[PDB]
Structures are given as structure tokens and as C-alpha cells.
Amino acid sequence: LLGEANSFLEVLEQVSHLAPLDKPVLIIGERGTGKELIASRLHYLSSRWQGPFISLNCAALNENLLDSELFGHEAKRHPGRFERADGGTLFLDELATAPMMVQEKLLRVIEYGELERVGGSQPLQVNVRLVCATNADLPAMVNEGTFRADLLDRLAFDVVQLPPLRERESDIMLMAEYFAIQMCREIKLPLFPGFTERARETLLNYRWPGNIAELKNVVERSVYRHGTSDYPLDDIIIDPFKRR
């Protein structure tokens, strides 16, 4: 993982302590900030490192399909993500989009380690270390009535705050250089020719709403359009949709 900003190195240190626990971990951060890599690192540094690492984007699924995907369904049965994560770690992204029904059932699995079943089948016990992520303000959602406080009192054992790229200014050029160099290997340029000061200013003054994912994509496109090692990269193409 790239970066040397102090906020980021403190995140890695915090992860190294949290990983060995079985407690749930909440990661707060914007899109493209590295949340799922952190979750993965929590898994591989824990004692479950040999178990499954399963991830799910909650905002991708309608209420009934999310319900089925997390908790499974019958009526001979489709196992949900908690079953597939048994002995391992489940990463739930976009937690704040989960409907209240899902949030409440999630509380029950954290509390009582089991998934109940429709039918004459008895409830299913599961053993899963949970990591969840969002950018929302969950305390504020609790005030609004759109996120459950009972859930947050079990889910938020501790909180990993991943800083946005605009607050890791010192890692911007370091990461752009790394991504530029990988893109030079991909298009077979002999050497990355460097960034002009103008390119640097463009990179450093942009607020990066998509953070590191967006940085990578902008840098790759830019290197490709530049297309040579004979002079430094001057034109950073932030927005490829801009017209004529």
C-alpha cells in the first residue's frame, strides 16, 4: 500500500492492533480511499487469515435482494454472505444504505452469532469477523432515525478513519508517480518522463472526489495521451467528458 502521510501511517498502526481481535471494525472514508484494502489487511493480519474474505456492496442491492444475499434464503437453499464467510471475515461496504430491516437483522447476528431459517429448519450459527464501511455520518443518522443506535453500539467497537486524498497532500505526487510508472510499463514507454510544475499544480489543487481510484485513472489516461518519454507530462486530463 502506498503512502507516508502521518494520518495514513497511523491508520496502518491502528489496523495492526485491531486485526487480532474478533470485534467488529467500522471504516469511515470516501469513495476510492482504500477501505476494502484496509478490510483485507484486517483479515490477513488476524488469526482468521486462512479463512474466507468475503465482501459486499450494500448499496448495490434492493432491500429484498440484500436481505437474501446477506442472510440467505430457502423455498434446496441459497447461502448468504455470512455463511460463506464462516471462519473468516465479511466486509460490508456502504453500510449506511442498508434498510432498517437489514440493520436490525445484522444486530442479531453480531449479538447472538446466528441466522434464523424459514421452515422447520433450526437457526444457523455462524462465526464471522465483520468489517463495515461508509462515508456517512452515522451519529447524525442515528439522530435522524435512519440508522439504528442498537446496531451502532455493537458494530462500532472502534473506528478507522481513512483520510481523503486531499488531506494527504504529501502522498499525491508519490502515488501519481507510481501510477504513471505502471502505466508506462503497460504502454511500453522506456521511462516516465516526470511531471511539469503545471501538471503538479493541477494534481495538487484538484480535490479528488474519487480519491485514489480517481487519481489512478486520471494519471493513466494522462500518460497514455502524452504517449512519450521525450518530454515531461504537462497535461493532466482530469475530465475526459469536456466537450469540443
Ligand SMILES: Nc1ncnc2c1ncn2[C@@H]1O[C@H](COP(=O)(O)OP(=O)(O)OP(=O)(O)O)[C@@H](O)[C@H]1O
Ligand atoms: N494506499 C494505497 N496504495 C496503493 N493503491 C491504493 C491505495 N489506496 C487505494 N488504492 C487503489 O485505489 C483504488 C481504490 O481503492 P479501494 O476500492 O480499496 O477504495 P474503497 O474506499 O474501497 O473505494 P470504493 O468502495 O469506492 O471501491 C483501487 O484501485 C486500489 O488498488
Ligand SMILES: [Mg+2]
Ligand atoms: Mg473498490
